[PDB]
Every structure is written in C-alpha cells, then in structure tokens.
C-alpha cells in the first residue's frame, strides 16, 4: 500500500513553474542531479570516517547514468548515503525549503533558471525534461522505498517490492517528456556531462546497450 503526502505549497509552485517553462537550456538538469549525487556520496564517505561499516552495504562509490529507451526513462544512480522513508518525506516535499520562494522571486526578476542549484533546490530542475519522477532510495538505516511525483501537489511513498535492490544509495528515475528523448542518446548524454561536470571526484558511468554485430 502506498501513502500519499502533500507538498509544501511553495514547492508545488516551483514544480509548476519548472515543468511548464520554455527555458531553452534544459540540459542543466543533469549538472544539478550529478551535483546532488556527488554530495550524497560525500556524505556517506564522511560518515564512514568514524563508522567504516557504513560502506559495507555498497563498497563502490559511483554515479551511474542508465538510459532506458523503450520506457522513455533516464536513471541517475549514486551509491551515496541514501534516504530513509522519513528523509524522503521531509527532504523532498513536506518541509519548506529555504531557497524555494527566494529562487522563484529571483526568476521573476530575471535570474537564469541555471541558478537553481545555488538556491539549494536543483533537484526540481528535473522537471525541465521529465513530467514524472520516481526516487528509489536505500539508506543503511531503513528499507528501500519509492518516492513518486508528477509535479502535482501530492506525492507518494511506497515500500519497494518492485525494483532492483540497491545496496545503498539513490536512483532518480526520470520519465522523460516526449520532446526530450535526446537525453536517451549516448552522444548527447556524454557531451552534456563533459560540459558542466569536470571536477566530479567520483567515476561517472554511462550504461550503454549495444547490439552485437
């Protein structure tokens, strides 16, 4: 059984603005999600300084990008600290985020949408290219859960009994908009990554499915 929660009003407002904006540089979403993945990895690494056992659930620290053409899905995975059920609810929707309103006010004044990360709400930039998202996460402190949103005022959280087991970490499964399928292409993904992420300390793995000649 899934549980439904209401987003903090300002977040709903932000998602509506982002999912509908005709901003030209939509590729910035990848930079923001890679940045968030890197931060999550930094967190588990730092925590492991005094609790080495924390890494055992998934010894490899990585960021992985997996296009799923048939499903028109793009997944961004990391083996970071992950989020418990409580953290998914709090961090992604119910708790008011400091820069949410501030960012929208900046946008109204003319700020570039690319500044979203500096306001601490870069996660929501995913709606530039997707109309739905499932955040699948596994924290060492809880079971695996699925947080889902379609930019609407409510989101759901469900105990995960349908996706692959992740040792520890988070998967952002983006359901791409019909006109943003270019982000399923290896060449396109590679150029975007190489452009806004040169100083990422973790390996960025691209999973490519090729037909054997």
Short mmCIF file of C-alpha atoms in Angstrom, two decimals:
data_model
loop_
_atom_site.label_atom_id
_atom_site.label_comp_id
_atom_site.label_asym_id
_atom_site.label_seq_id
_atom_site.Cartn_x
_atom_site.Cartn_y
_atom_site.Cartn_z
CA UNK A 1 0.00 0.00 0.00
CA UNK A 2 1.23 3.47 -0.91
CA UNK A 3 0.99 6.53 1.34
CA UNK A 4 0.15 9.97 -0.01
CA UNK A 5 1.54 13.27 1.29
CA UNK A 6 1.01 16.91 0.38
CA UNK A 7 3.90 19.06 -0.84
CA UNK A 8 4.71 22.31 0.94
CA UNK A 9 2.83 24.94 -1.12
CA UNK A 10 5.94 26.76 -2.40
CA UNK A 11 7.46 23.54 -3.75
CA UNK A 12 4.31 22.79 -5.73
CA UNK A 13 4.54 26.32 -7.10
CA UNK A 14 8.17 25.80 -8.10
CA UNK A 15 7.49 22.48 -9.85
CA UNK A 16 4.63 24.01 -11.82
CA UNK A 17 6.87 26.82 -13.00
CA UNK A 18 9.70 24.46 -13.97
CA UNK A 19 7.62 21.80 -15.73
CA UNK A 20 5.92 24.49 -17.85
CA UNK A 21 8.81 26.88 -18.53
CA UNK A 22 10.04 27.27 -22.11
CA UNK A 23 13.59 27.91 -20.87
CA UNK A 24 15.97 26.97 -23.69
CA UNK A 25 18.80 25.34 -21.72
CA UNK A 26 17.04 22.30 -20.27
CA UNK A 27 20.26 20.26 -20.24
CA UNK A 28 21.23 21.94 -16.96
CA UNK A 29 19.17 19.35 -15.09
CA UNK A 30 21.95 16.77 -15.49
CA UNK A 31 24.55 19.02 -13.87
CA UNK A 32 22.23 19.55 -10.92
CA UNK A 33 21.45 15.86 -10.43
CA UNK A 34 25.11 14.86 -10.74
CA UNK A 35 25.98 17.52 -8.18
CA UNK A 36 23.37 16.13 -5.78
CA UNK A 37 24.67 12.59 -6.34
CA UNK A 38 28.21 13.74 -5.60
CA UNK A 39 27.06 15.43 -2.39
CA UNK A 40 25.28 12.25 -1.27
CA UNK A 41 28.48 10.30 -1.90
CA UNK A 42 30.50 12.86 0.08
CA UNK A 43 28.10 12.33 2.98
CA UNK A 44 28.50 8.56 3.17
CA UNK A 45 32.29 8.89 2.78
CA UNK A 46 32.46 11.41 5.60
CA UNK A 47 30.18 9.35 7.83
CA UNK A 48 32.40 6.32 7.19
CA UNK A 49 35.38 8.16 8.67
CA UNK A 50 34.14 7.15 12.13
CA UNK A 51 31.84 4.30 11.12
CA UNK A 52 33.68 2.30 8.39
CA UNK A 53 30.99 -0.41 8.45
CA UNK A 54 28.62 2.07 6.76
CA UNK A 55 30.35 1.45 3.42
CA UNK A 56 29.95 -2.34 3.52
CA UNK A 57 26.43 -2.26 2.06
CA UNK A 58 27.99 -0.99 -1.18
CA UNK A 59 31.82 -0.60 -1.18
CA UNK A 60 31.94 1.02 -4.63
CA UNK A 61 31.35 4.78 -4.74
CA UNK A 62 29.95 5.82 -8.10
CA UNK A 63 27.46 7.86 -10.10
CA UNK A 64 25.78 5.88 -12.88
CA UNK A 65 23.59 7.02 -15.77
CA UNK A 66 21.28 4.49 -17.43
CA UNK A 67 19.07 5.29 -20.43
CA UNK A 68 16.02 3.03 -20.85
CA UNK A 69 14.74 3.90 -24.39
CA UNK A 70 11.73 1.58 -24.51
CA UNK A 71 10.36 3.13 -21.33
CA UNK A 72 11.48 6.65 -22.26
CA UNK A 73 13.29 6.69 -18.93
CA UNK A 74 16.66 8.04 -17.81
CA UNK A 75 18.07 6.89 -14.47
CA UNK A 76 20.70 8.73 -12.43
CA UNK A 77 22.06 6.49 -9.67
CA UNK A 78 24.59 7.02 -6.89
CA UNK A 79 25.86 4.84 -4.06
CA UNK A 80 25.62 7.75 -1.63
CA UNK A 81 24.11 7.95 1.84
CA UNK A 82 20.57 7.34 0.60
CA UNK A 83 17.33 8.45 2.26
CA UNK A 84 15.11 6.67 4.78
CA UNK A 85 11.33 6.84 4.41
CA UNK A 86 11.29 9.77 6.84
CA UNK A 87 14.02 11.61 4.93
CA UNK A 88 12.29 11.15 1.57
CA UNK A 89 9.12 12.68 3.01
CA UNK A 90 10.95 15.52 4.76
CA UNK A 91 13.76 16.30 2.30
CA UNK A 92 11.75 16.15 -0.92
CA UNK A 93 8.32 17.51 -0.09
CA UNK A 94 6.74 18.26 3.29
CA UNK A 95 9.36 20.56 4.81
CA UNK A 96 9.61 24.10 3.45
CA UNK A 97 12.96 24.60 1.72
CA UNK A 98 14.83 27.82 2.44
CA UNK A 99 15.55 28.84 -1.15
CA UNK A 100 12.27 27.77 -2.76
CA UNK A 101 10.46 31.12 -2.60
CA UNK A 102 13.74 33.01 -2.91
CA UNK A 103 14.53 31.27 -6.19
CA UNK A 104 11.10 31.99 -7.68
CA UNK A 105 11.50 35.63 -6.71
CA UNK A 106 14.89 35.68 -8.42
CA UNK A 107 13.32 34.14 -11.53
CA UNK A 108 10.64 36.83 -11.57
CA UNK A 109 13.42 39.43 -11.54
CA UNK A 110 15.25 37.82 -14.45
CA UNK A 111 17.65 35.32 -12.89
CA UNK A 112 18.64 32.45 -15.16
CA UNK A 113 16.99 29.13 -14.35
CA UNK A 114 20.53 27.71 -14.14
CA UNK A 115 20.95 29.45 -10.77
CA UNK A 116 18.56 26.92 -9.23
CA UNK A 117 21.40 24.95 -7.63
CA UNK A 118 22.70 27.98 -5.76
CA UNK A 119 19.31 28.24 -4.06
CA UNK A 120 19.57 24.63 -2.92
CA UNK A 121 16.63 23.35 -4.94
CA UNK A 122 18.39 21.98 -8.02
CA UNK A 123 16.62 18.63 -7.62
CA UNK A 124 13.47 20.15 -9.07
CA UNK A 125 15.27 21.07 -12.30
CA UNK A 126 14.49 17.51 -13.40
CA UNK A 127 11.04 18.75 -14.40
CA UNK A 128 12.63 20.66 -17.28
CA UNK A 129 12.94 17.33 -19.09
CA UNK A 130 10.61 14.94 -17.24
CA UNK A 131 6.93 15.03 -16.34
CA UNK A 132 7.25 12.31 -13.70
CA UNK A 133 9.94 11.01 -11.36
CA UNK A 134 10.46 8.10 -9.02
CA UNK A 135 13.15 8.48 -6.38
CA UNK A 136 14.16 4.98 -5.27
CA UNK A 137 16.37 5.10 -2.20
CA UNK A 138 18.07 2.78 0.26
CA UNK A 139 19.65 4.22 3.40
CA UNK A 140 21.58 1.88 5.69
CA UNK A 141 19.03 2.99 8.28
CA UNK A 142 15.86 1.83 6.53
CA UNK A 143 14.29 -0.43 3.91
CA UNK A 144 14.20 0.50 0.21
CA UNK A 145 11.43 3.00 -0.64
CA UNK A 146 9.97 4.70 -3.70
CA UNK A 147 9.00 8.39 -3.62
CA UNK A 148 6.95 9.45 -6.66
CA UNK A 149 5.86 12.81 -8.07
CA UNK A 150 4.27 14.16 -11.25
CA UNK A 151 4.79 17.82 -10.31
CA UNK A 152 1.34 17.81 -8.75
CA UNK A 153 0.54 18.92 -5.21
CA UNK A 154 0.89 15.45 -3.71
CA UNK A 155 3.50 12.69 -3.74
CA UNK A 156 3.51 9.05 -2.70
CA UNK A 157 5.94 6.92 -0.73
CA UNK A 158 5.81 3.15 -1.11
CA UNK A 159 7.83 0.29 0.36
CA UNK A 160 9.84 -1.01 -2.62
CA UNK A 161 8.94 -4.54 -3.73
CA UNK A 162 9.26 -3.96 -7.48
CA UNK A 163 12.71 -2.52 -8.31
CA UNK A 164 16.21 -3.97 -8.32
CA UNK A 165 17.83 -3.98 -4.89
CA UNK A 166 20.32 -1.17 -4.45
CA UNK A 167 22.98 -1.91 -1.85
CA UNK A 168 22.87 1.67 -0.65
CA UNK A 169 22.14 4.87 -2.49
CA UNK A 170 19.55 6.55 -4.65
CA UNK A 171 18.13 6.25 -8.14
CA UNK A 172 16.34 9.17 -9.76
CA UNK A 173 14.20 7.53 -12.43
CA UNK A 174 13.12 10.27 -14.82
CA UNK A 175 10.17 9.69 -17.14
CA UNK A 176 11.19 11.98 -20.00
CA UNK A 177 8.82 14.30 -21.84
CA UNK A 178 8.11 13.23 -25.43
CA UNK A 179 10.18 16.06 -26.89
CA UNK A 180 13.17 15.49 -24.60
CA UNK A 181 14.11 11.98 -25.72
CA UNK A 182 17.50 13.23 -26.89
CA UNK A 183 18.65 12.58 -23.33
CA UNK A 184 18.37 8.84 -24.01
CA UNK A 185 21.16 9.09 -26.60
CA UNK A 186 24.73 8.23 -25.62
CA UNK A 187 26.35 11.01 -27.67
CA UNK A 188 24.05 13.69 -26.25
CA UNK A 189 24.43 12.47 -22.66
CA UNK A 190 28.22 12.42 -23.00
CA UNK A 191 28.53 15.99 -24.26
CA UNK A 192 26.24 17.38 -21.56
CA UNK A 193 28.19 15.59 -18.83
CA UNK A 194 31.61 16.66 -20.09
CA UNK A 195 30.45 20.28 -20.23
CA UNK A 196 29.21 21.14 -16.73
CA UNK A 197 30.93 18.46 -14.63
CA UNK A 198 34.74 18.33 -14.92
CA UNK A 199 35.57 18.33 -11.22
CA UNK A 200 33.50 15.39 -10.02
CA UNK A 201 35.54 13.20 -7.66
CA UNK A 202 33.56 10.05 -8.41
CA UNK A 203 33.50 7.99 -11.60
CA UNK A 204 30.52 8.83 -13.80
CA UNK A 205 29.45 5.60 -15.50
CA UNK A 206 27.25 5.53 -18.59
CA UNK A 207 25.41 2.27 -19.22
CA UNK A 208 25.12 1.72 -22.96
CA UNK A 209 23.11 -1.05 -24.59
CA UNK A 210 24.62 -2.02 -27.95
CA UNK A 211 23.54 -4.73 -30.39
CA UNK A 212 26.28 -7.28 -31.02
CA UNK A 213 27.26 -7.15 -34.69
#
